[PDB]
């Protein structure tokens, strides 16, 4: 394969987390997931999931009610009530599961983009937006610079002047 990600697809070879980086260096290549965004995404989901169980109270149950022959009016009201409540709850659970699976799926693809942007505005001109979710460095950098990008530091002046010449190769 030609590697790349985000707009292309998912990385089978990454394990550390949900969101990460690839990097192509002279000091090897690989994958390294950003655990800061992954944790601040895990926290969210954990609290989305737990907030569903913590609100839906585990309740003591008592159901079994018995009516005689000349009481089928009440037997049918008990039936009306028993089925009526199962009806509401089956709807309520079934809807929230579909509606929030939708919200979890958008949450991620937003977190991914919100990270693709973190880097774009961090590097600028010093790299081209080569085909989908990747950047082609206009200056060639050390693993120290890679981990500078990953932890948000980078330091734009160091490589700005270097890139200025390599960018002009048109």
């Amino acid at each position: 394969g030609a590697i790349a990600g985000f707009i292309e697809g998912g990385w089978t070879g990454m394990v550390d987390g949900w969101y990460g980086y690839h990097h192509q260096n002279e000091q090897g290549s690989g994958y390294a997931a950003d655990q800061k965004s992954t944790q601040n995404a895990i926290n969210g989901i954990t609290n989305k999931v737990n907030s569903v169980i913590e609100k839906m109270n585990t309740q003591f149950t008592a159901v079994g009610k018995e009516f005689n022959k000349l009481e089928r009016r009440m037997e049918n009201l008990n039936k009306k009530v028993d089925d009526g409540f199962i009806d509401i709850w089956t709807y309520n659970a079934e809807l929230l599961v579909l509606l929030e699976n939708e919200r979890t799926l958008d949450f991620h693809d937003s977190n991914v983009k919100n990270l693709y942007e973190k880097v774009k505005s961090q590097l600028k001109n010093n790299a081209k937006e080569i085909g989908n979710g990747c950047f082609e460095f206009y200056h060639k950098c050390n693993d120290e610079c890679m981990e500078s990008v990953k932890n948000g530091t980078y330091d734009y002046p160091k490589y700005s002047e270097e890139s200025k010449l390599n960018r002009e190769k048109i």
Binding site: G1, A2, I3, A4, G5, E8, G9, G10, W11, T12, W18, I45, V49, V52, T61, I86, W89, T90, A93, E94, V97, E100, N101, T104, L105, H108, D109
Partner: peptide
């Protein structure tokens, strides 16, 4: 108790194998 057949919440993301 509910009548539902399947109740699964997504924690992760859409599983897509690239290239």
């Amino acid at each position: 108790y509910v009548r539902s057949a399947k109740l699964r919440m997504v924690t992760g993301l859409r599983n897509i194998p690239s290239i």
